[PDB]
């Protein structure tokens, strides 16, 4: 951020329903996302499983 003001980043993690779905998209069976700055960080682990049909 070389700008004069604060930046708000919106991002996400995908939780697939089946392992097949995981691999069909990402290859690797277990994905992961780490979004960070100098003084803070978030690591989200996606979780494969079923949720109500929506």
């Amino acid at each position: 951020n070389n700008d004069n003001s604060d930046k708000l980043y919106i991002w996400g993690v995908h939780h697939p329903s089946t392992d097949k779905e995981q691999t069909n998209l990402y290859v690797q069976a277990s994905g992961k996302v780490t979004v960070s700055t100098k003084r803070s960080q978030q690591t989200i682990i996606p979780n494969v499983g079923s949720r109500p049909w929506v």
Partner: antibody
Amino acid sequence: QVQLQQSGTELKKPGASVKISCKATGYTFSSYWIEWIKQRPGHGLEWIGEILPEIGMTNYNENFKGKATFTANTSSNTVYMQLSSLTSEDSAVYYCARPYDYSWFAYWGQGTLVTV
Amino acid sequence: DIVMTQSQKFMSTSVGDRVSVTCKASQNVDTNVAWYQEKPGQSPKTLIYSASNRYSGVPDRFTGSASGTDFTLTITNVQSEDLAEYFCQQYNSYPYTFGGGTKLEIKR
């Protein structure tokens, strides 16, 4: 045994559109991509694109963008490809294929001939 | 895009003899390459994957190999039922691309 059943032969006037179907049987329908391949008598094999049925994610070859549209009926275990604005260039045999799991092709359909 | 070049449009061989089709990727596909056999009027059938690996139900005659970007499909002891067109495919990255195809011919 895994089977991909495509639709009948098709004849279409130039400028019209066509919907070809691929009916998947003998495996869990949602666990695999469905691929579409075009064959004209002297261009060999061109890859149209793929669709992942559950979430309806479609991935097209840059060259077919706007020509081809995939859709999926999860209840009928069927994948449809739609070709629009047909020209003679689109006259070919169209195959649908299922990967072994995520990449290379294992199972093929019997082909659908489309003449324009 | 990645080009898969099969420079041989037609091959000549005799039954029982040995024949090799070459395919050259135009940039690294690693070992992800498949070989398919299209007989006249039928749908393509799967021969090889991972460039060296025999798909189930495929006779031991057909063997794939790879060195660098060079991929070779070798049939030893060619039979008469082996008359067909041979396609190679790089499944390494999108878009998937194919070779021009090589028609196997039995000459004399």
